[PDB]
Amino acid sequence: SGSNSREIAWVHSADEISVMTCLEPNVYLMDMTRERLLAVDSKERIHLIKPAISTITPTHCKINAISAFNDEQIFVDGVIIDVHDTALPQQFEPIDYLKQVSPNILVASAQKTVIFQLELQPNDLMMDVSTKSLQEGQDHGVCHLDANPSAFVKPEEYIVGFDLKNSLLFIDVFRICEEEIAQKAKISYLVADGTMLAMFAVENRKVQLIYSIEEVHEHCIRQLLFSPCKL
């Protein structure tokens, strides 16, 4: 699912081919969105939700606005008020929310636990890394990266710096950087790739990536508007 600048790639799991309405679609698995109104259709997901409860992740739905709207519910609307901006959400009915603060929060869709530690974060509910020091609460101040835009856990938790890096935690092996996700085989030092870093597509400045299996079978999406579908 890719917002109209609502398309596909020979599949029916997100939008009926051509569906003009967006900022981001949701096919995490009706592909959710947020207008500059939630315009979600049915091509293959659940077929009907229309305009019901921006950046939505899995609902084994929750919203994400530019305000303190940590709302997230069913169709049942629940505007959990974080009390500035409700930033990056992740699903771990508990859902972790990460504002423009490294402390962050865990809210059960009701705040499960809330932590405060200093003056992108991974999933392994208490074993969670924090970035903006590299403290991993349950904590461990790790000021090794000069800041910290993303961190991801063991497939040795690798955390990127704003000036490349994606070092080791528990040797700073170096190839903003190309951000990271986890494999059963570490995605080669949690970089997404530097070929195969030992433990190039068109243009650069990639955002967020995933992967099917070790090395091969990229999940496409690689850059803006033009990414390889090779491997």
Residues in the chain: 231
| CA torsion through residues 96, 97, 101, 104, sign | negative
**Helices (DSSP H) in 53-204: which residue ranges?**
187-190
CB 175 within 8 Å of CB 191: yes
Residue 47 buriedness (CB in 10 A; 0-12 / 13-18 / 19+): exposed
Amino acid at position 229, single letter: C
Which token pair is 204?
């650069």
Q: What are phi and psi of 114, to 5 degrees?
A: -125, 130
Is 34 in contact with 22 (CB distance < 8 Å)? yes
Residues 148-184, buried b or exposed e (16+ Cβ, 10 A)? bbbbbbebebbbbbeeebbbebeeeeeeebbbbbbee
Sheet of 94-97, strands arranged across: 89-91, 94-97, 105-108, 111-114
Neighbouring-strand partners of residue 80: 70
List residues bridging with 158 in a β-sheet: 152
Q: Is 121 exposed, middle or buried (0-12, 13-18, 19+ CB in 10 A)?
A: buried
Q: Which three-class secondary structure string do you get for 171-198? A: CCCCCCCCCCCCCCCCHHHHCCCCCCCC
Return d(Cα 153, Cα 76) in angstroms, integer. Answer: 34
Q: Residue 73 burial (CB < 10 Å; 0-12/13-18/19+)? A: middle
Nearest to 140 by CA among 173, 161, 118, 163: 118
Strand intervals (E) in 12-123: 69-71, 79-81, 89-91, 94-97, 105-108, 111-114
Resolution for this model in angstroms, one decimal place?
Answer: 7.0
Residues 6 or more apart from 68 whose CB is under 8 A from it?
Answer: 81, 82, 83, 84, 85, 86
* Residue type for position 171: I
Smallest Cα–Cα separation from 142: which of 155, 152, 133, 150? 133
